[PDB]
């Protein structure tokens with residue numbers, strides 16, 4: 726099955742998922758000089774005050790923090806979006822070394838990690854129906870650089886020891902995702918895809934310009950997770966990122982001058 730190794734990684738995915746070579750694949754390099762300010766773009770509305778986290782899961786590719794998405798509890802609106810998108814989960818991609826790990830790049834620069842907050846368009850009723858639609862999903866992407874610790878990340882870091890291997894999960898209620906955001910909501914946006922199989926072309930990407938800083942100790946704990954299941958040979962969960970894909974017939978828009 727698919728993964729991030731030499732024998733099952735991003736260069737192999739197209740054999741099972743031919744859309745891997747499609748017209749709106751993600752991630753992409755964000756060329757900051759070619760991206761154009763769009764004054765028609767609205768401010769992003771990130772409404773996470775009533776978010777209800779459920780659980781954290783090691784799925785063998787990353788770890789996901791899952792949320793209750795049965796009502797409009799944590800939603801994303803505005804910006805390039807029409808209507809309302811409900812938060813279903815977040816996860817990260819990260820590297821084996823601080824100089825790599827992000828999926829999007831900015832003028833070819835790679836960050837140490839990238840946070841993805843995944844949301845689905847409520848007009849389609851459920852996530853499964855949303856991923857059959859060209860405007861089904863909105864993913865808020867946030868870069869991580871290594872510097873001072875991010876206090877709102879520490880609760881995530883301190884539970885990772887309990888989900889070391891694939892298939893393990895733990896209760897993760899009462900987590901506030903507002904603690905993962907930077908100060909500014911300035912962003913770039915473009916139409917793209919899921920960055921993991923099945924690579925579906927359903928996503929409005931919203932990538933924040935301002936990174937968050939996390940400490941070396943925080944990102945080191947990410948790197949102690951395992952891709953494998955319990956009792957199997959240990960393979961550290963590192964370098965779980967897809968590289969930038971061809972931009973093709975797309976334009977990246979900026980919310981800021």
Ligand SMILES: NS(=O)(=O)/N=C1\NCc2ccccc2N1
Pocket residue numbers: 841843864918919920921922923
């Ligand atoms: N890295 S990503 O673009 O959020 N990719 C994702 N997100 C959410 C998801 C749910 C189910 C199956 C695959 C994926 N892939």
Ligand SMILES: [Zn+2]
Pocket residue numbers: 816817818841920
């Ligand atoms: Zn992701």
